[PDB]
Motif scaffolding. Structure first.
Motif, PDB file in Angstrom:
ATOM      1  N   UNK A 217       0.883  -0.982   0.767  1.00  0.00           N
ATOM      2  CA  UNK A 217      -0.456   0.228   0.217  1.00  0.00           C
ATOM      3  C   UNK A 217       0.626   1.907   0.318  1.00  0.00           C
ATOM      4  N   UNK A 218       1.951   1.392   0.719  1.00  0.00           N
ATOM      5  CA  UNK A 218       3.113   2.394   0.885  1.00  0.00           C
ATOM      6  C   UNK A 218       3.822   3.028   0.023  1.00  0.00           C
ATOM      7  N   UNK A 219       4.202   1.110  -0.672  1.00  0.00           N
ATOM      8  CA  UNK A 219       5.628   1.231  -2.152  1.00  0.00           C
ATOM      9  C   UNK A 219       4.533   1.505  -3.102  1.00  0.00           C
ATOM     10  N   UNK A 220       3.601   1.115  -3.409  1.00  0.00           N
ATOM     11  CA  UNK A 220       2.850   0.657  -4.641  1.00  0.00           C
ATOM     12  C   UNK A 220       2.995   2.406  -4.872  1.00  0.00           C
ATOM     13  N   UNK A 221       1.827   3.202  -4.088  1.00  0.00           N
ATOM     14  CA  UNK A 221       2.084   4.344  -3.920  1.00  0.00           C
ATOM     15  C   UNK A 221       3.213   5.534  -3.842  1.00  0.00           C
ATOM     16  N   UNK A 222       4.040   5.095  -3.857  1.00  0.00           N
ATOM     17  CA  UNK A 222       5.509   5.612  -3.017  1.00  0.00           C
ATOM     18  C   UNK A 222       6.273   5.491  -4.613  1.00  0.00           C
ATOM     19  N   UNK A 223       5.880   4.594  -5.769  1.00  0.00           N
ATOM     20  CA  UNK A 223       6.403   4.233  -6.654  1.00  0.00           C
ATOM     21  C   UNK A 223       4.721   4.860  -8.190  1.00  0.00           C
ATOM     22  N   UNK A 224       3.689   5.788  -7.356  1.00  0.00           N
ATOM     23  CA  UNK A 224       3.095   5.697  -8.185  1.00  0.00           C
ATOM     24  C   UNK A 224       3.292   7.684  -8.636  1.00  0.00           C
ATOM     25  N   UNK A 225       4.014   7.895  -6.911  1.00  0.00           N
ATOM     26  CA  UNK A 225       3.996   8.987  -7.533  1.00  0.00           C
ATOM     27  C   UNK A 225       5.198   9.348  -8.271  1.00  0.00           C
ATOM     28  N   UNK A 226       5.956   8.443  -8.647  1.00  0.00           N
ATOM     29  CA  UNK A 226       6.716   8.588  -9.731  1.00  0.00           C
ATOM     30  C   UNK A 226       6.377   8.042 -11.460  1.00  0.00           C
ATOM     31  N   UNK A 227       5.576   7.557 -11.268  1.00  0.00           N
ATOM     32  CA  UNK A 227       5.320   6.752 -12.445  1.00  0.00           C
ATOM     33  C   UNK A 227       5.486   5.489 -12.813  1.00  0.00           C
ATOM     34  N   UNK A 228       5.810   4.837 -11.623  1.00  0.00           N
ATOM     35  CA  UNK A 228       6.629   4.437 -12.876  1.00  0.00           C
ATOM     36  C   UNK A 228       6.061   2.533 -11.975  1.00  0.00           C
ATOM     37  N   UNK A 229       5.914   1.473 -13.451  1.00  0.00           N
ATOM     38  CA  UNK A 229       4.800   0.171 -13.182  1.00  0.00           C
ATOM     39  C   UNK A 229       5.603  -0.646 -12.537  1.00  0.00           C
ATOM     40  N   UNK A 230       4.624  -0.963 -11.870  1.00  0.00           N
ATOM     41  CA  UNK A 230       4.669  -2.047 -10.566  1.00  0.00           C
ATOM     42  C   UNK A 230       4.303  -3.105 -11.028  1.00  0.00           C
ATOM     43  N   UNK A 231       4.874  -4.321 -10.485  1.00  0.00           N
ATOM     44  CA  UNK A 231       5.075  -5.474 -10.657  1.00  0.00           C
ATOM     45  C   UNK A 231       4.790  -7.255  -8.968  1.00  0.00           C
ATOM     46  N   UNK A 232       3.750  -7.450  -8.722  1.00  0.00           N
ATOM     47  CA  UNK A 232       4.410  -7.973  -7.462  1.00  0.00           C
ATOM     48  C   UNK A 232       3.868  -9.744  -7.655  1.00  0.00           C
ATOM     49  N   UNK A 233       5.075 -10.162  -7.337  1.00  0.00           N
ATOM     50  CA  UNK A 233       4.371 -11.781  -6.685  1.00  0.00           C
ATOM     51  C   UNK A 233       3.784 -12.311  -5.583  1.00  0.00           C
ATOM     52  N   UNK A 234       2.771 -13.307  -6.081  1.00  0.00           N
ATOM     53  CA  UNK A 234       1.640 -13.190  -5.480  1.00  0.00           C
ATOM     54  C   UNK A 234       2.017 -14.970  -4.967  1.00  0.00           C
ATOM     55  N   UNK A 235       3.092 -15.523  -5.355  1.00  0.00           N
ATOM     56  CA  UNK A 235       3.328 -16.926  -5.689  1.00  0.00           C
ATOM     57  C   UNK A 235       2.966 -17.198  -3.659  1.00  0.00           C
ATOM     58  N   UNK A 236       4.263 -17.315  -2.911  1.00  0.00           N
ATOM     59  CA  UNK A 236       3.616 -17.128  -0.895  1.00  0.00           C
ATOM     60  C   UNK A 236       2.058 -16.433  -1.211  1.00  0.00           C
ATOM     61  N   UNK A 237       0.496 -15.887  -1.406  1.00  0.00           N
ATOM     62  CA  UNK A 237      -0.156 -15.801  -0.918  1.00  0.00           C
ATOM     63  C   UNK A 237      -1.670 -16.936  -1.298  1.00  0.00           C
ATOM     64  N   UNK A 238      -0.963 -17.164  -3.393  1.00  0.00           N
ATOM     65  CA  UNK A 238      -2.455 -17.194  -3.819  1.00  0.00           C
ATOM     66  C   UNK A 238      -2.910 -18.106  -3.193  1.00  0.00           C
ATOM     67  N   UNK A 239      -4.473 -17.619  -2.828  1.00  0.00           N
ATOM     68  CA  UNK A 239      -5.407 -18.910  -2.407  1.00  0.00           C
ATOM     69  C   UNK A 239      -5.985 -18.147  -1.221  1.00  0.00           C
TER      70      UNK A 239
END
Lengths: 363, 369
Positions: A159-181
């Motif tokens: 939530x914090x990092x994603x917003x900090x990335x969009x502060x800079x217009x950078x694209x965001x990739x998230x690995x959700x392997x260890x969370x799926x389901x």
């Protein structure tokens, strides 16, 4: 032959025979126990019977191999996206995709050709901002983040990092392997549990952990996210997976949308073990049960090695972690909970950790 | 949606339902028909029942997935080598391995496989099937650097044979290492079905033999085999197998069973060649221009000189109840359009007769004969 674990006879997702002993499995990543799900096996067997052992390519004018269409649709439903690309192997998705999407900058956690690599301090929202703010504004940027950190089993402050990335217009990739389901309202991952649906550009993942088969995937809502399929400088070499593999994966993915009981069982088990080990005075990687990984921290390589040995002999298999993977002087015994572990098994695991820990001198 | 073939219902290795029509399959590479072999299916089903839909990595010191150890042993027995490395995908073996083994020179046929036709390796292309251009181009290279010559046993385009015996000797004239792709030969070339290299008595003179499970074996994945003492280091190669997955229980089981069966499938091997020769001779006696004068392999390619004509005949053949491959430049020399038949050991002599009848009917209608 370090900590070589060979499982001769496998009763279920939570128990097998290791070195002639009935052993509880607690160091694999089969979170939702899908590898032995009755419907999954059946689908696999049927696909084998109807379609044989393999097929050919059948490409169809774009990097959609005809045998992936169905499994790719399951991912669309699961993640509620329009884009879904399946890969032959986990890594062709894991870091294959990154080099595909990126002279350009790739910004990634320190403990995470054609792309300038930028490493920010682990779990440091602020170092991410600082490092990002020092980069040329014109070029294209991609920030790679994980939902769950596999080492200690903690949660990224997306939530914090994603917003900090969009502060800079950078694209965001998230690995959700260890969370799926098992993270968020639909089990889509940490990003969902933090209400980021629609704010994340790409979600990468693997079939190894929850799904329970070979291969990986990316999902997106990017309109142009079909072009990816045709990347031949960052290859679209990839194989079409055999009938049983896709059948199993699809069934498993579809079932992961409704596996509410497994999801509730996974967390009980996770919380039961976390709280339990803590109340015995073990140093855990996290104060609160944040994920399905529960890592016990030890300060001595020898001590860690012996406890592992003791635990294995006692009838329990867990993961051993050490530098290089961990910070030097950090040695981990890493438990990975399964939705198929019975409450009784968790109690036995606690009993075993107590017995072993005492004997070795950890508690 | 060019020549998109979707097979809705698959009766056997040689027939399926395409666009609502019972269609004979003659454009796939299931040479030995293993994909539906009763023992293979069974093996796959048991492995699924006993071991589940997947297992974890279990990688070790030498990047060796325990789950591949058994299938890798089958390849050792099959090829009679000491070294055998299985890959997750055909390409991770097909060209993945080349970039792995090579500021160095890679010397390969100008028309090298539709997989072969980046980085750390200087590419050198010699005239197709030209033993002499190979010598000439090799002799113009710096002597000191490390060189690898890549060759195929069977050329998939026209279905002819590389003069390996000659080329291999020309390579060893220069101390260059030799890689041979034996994908289109596995199970039906040489005393043990090891490939064109074996049929030309080159056992022991070839450094690396690459191949895929797609064609004869009948599953996903590929492999390299060697007798090189140091051929275990490869497993740990900086990029190209520390991105490899362990294949699931059913895939491995099927592959192993299939590979072991391919050591004894004498009847299949005799049927494959009969079918191949029957078709080759038959089409020839109708006045078709084939890629080869003699039946050299399981691929029989009909040559046409007009894209439109080729396209229409394919259409006619499909409508008539036959599926074959269409080839066009970029994959062929411009003005070369191929209808490519790929024989199956499971095709009945009756089916081959029906195929001949169909090719006659279609070819006449279109104007090819």
């Amino acid at each position: 032959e370090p900590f070589a674990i060979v499982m001769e006879q496998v009763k279920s997702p939570t128990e097998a025979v290791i070195r002639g002993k009935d052993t509880i499995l607690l160091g694999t990543y089969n979170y939702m126990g899908m590898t032995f799900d009755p419907d999954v096996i059946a689908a696999g067997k049927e696909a084998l019977e109807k379609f044989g052992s393999g097929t050919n390519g059948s490409r169809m004018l774009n990097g959609t191999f005809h045998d992936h269409m169905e499994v790719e649709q399951a991912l669309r439903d699961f993640y509620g996206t329009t884009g879904a690309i399946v890969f032959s192997t986990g890594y062709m998705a894991n870091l294959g995709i990154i080099s595909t999407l990126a002279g350009e900058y790739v910004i990634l956690d320190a403990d995470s050709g054609n792309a300038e690599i930028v490493r920010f301090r682990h779990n440091s929202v602020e170092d991410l901002d600082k490092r990002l703010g020092r980069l040329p504004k014109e070029p294209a940027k991609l920030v790679v983040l994980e939902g769950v950190y596999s080492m200690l089993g903690d949660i990224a402050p997306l939530k914090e990092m994603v917003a900090v990335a969009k502060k800079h217009g950078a694209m965001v990739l998230v690995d959700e392997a260890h969370s799926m389901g098992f993270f968020g309202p639909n089990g889509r991952g940490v990003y969902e549990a933090q209400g980021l649906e629609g704010q994340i550009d790409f979600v990468v993942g693997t079939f190894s952990k929850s799904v329970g088969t070979v291969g990986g995937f990316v999902v997106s809502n990017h309109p142009k996210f079909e072009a990816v399929r045709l990347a031949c400088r960052p290859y679209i070499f990839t194989a079409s997976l055999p009938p049983s593999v896709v059948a199993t994966a699809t069934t498993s993915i579809r079932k992961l949308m409704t596996a509410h009981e497994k999801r509730e069982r996974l967390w009980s088990n996770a919380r039961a073990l976390h709280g339990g080990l803590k109340a015995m005075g073990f140093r855990l990687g996290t104060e609160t049960c944040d994920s399905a990984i529960v890592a016990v921290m030890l300060e001595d390589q020898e001590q860690a090695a012996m406890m592992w040995q003791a635990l294995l002999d006692g009838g329990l298999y867990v993961n051993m972690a050490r530098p290089p993977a961990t910070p030097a002087g950090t040695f981990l015994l890493r438990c990975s909970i399964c939705a198929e572990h019975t409450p009784a098994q968790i109690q036995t695991v606690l009993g075993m950790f107590q017995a072993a820990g005492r004997a070795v001198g950890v508690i």
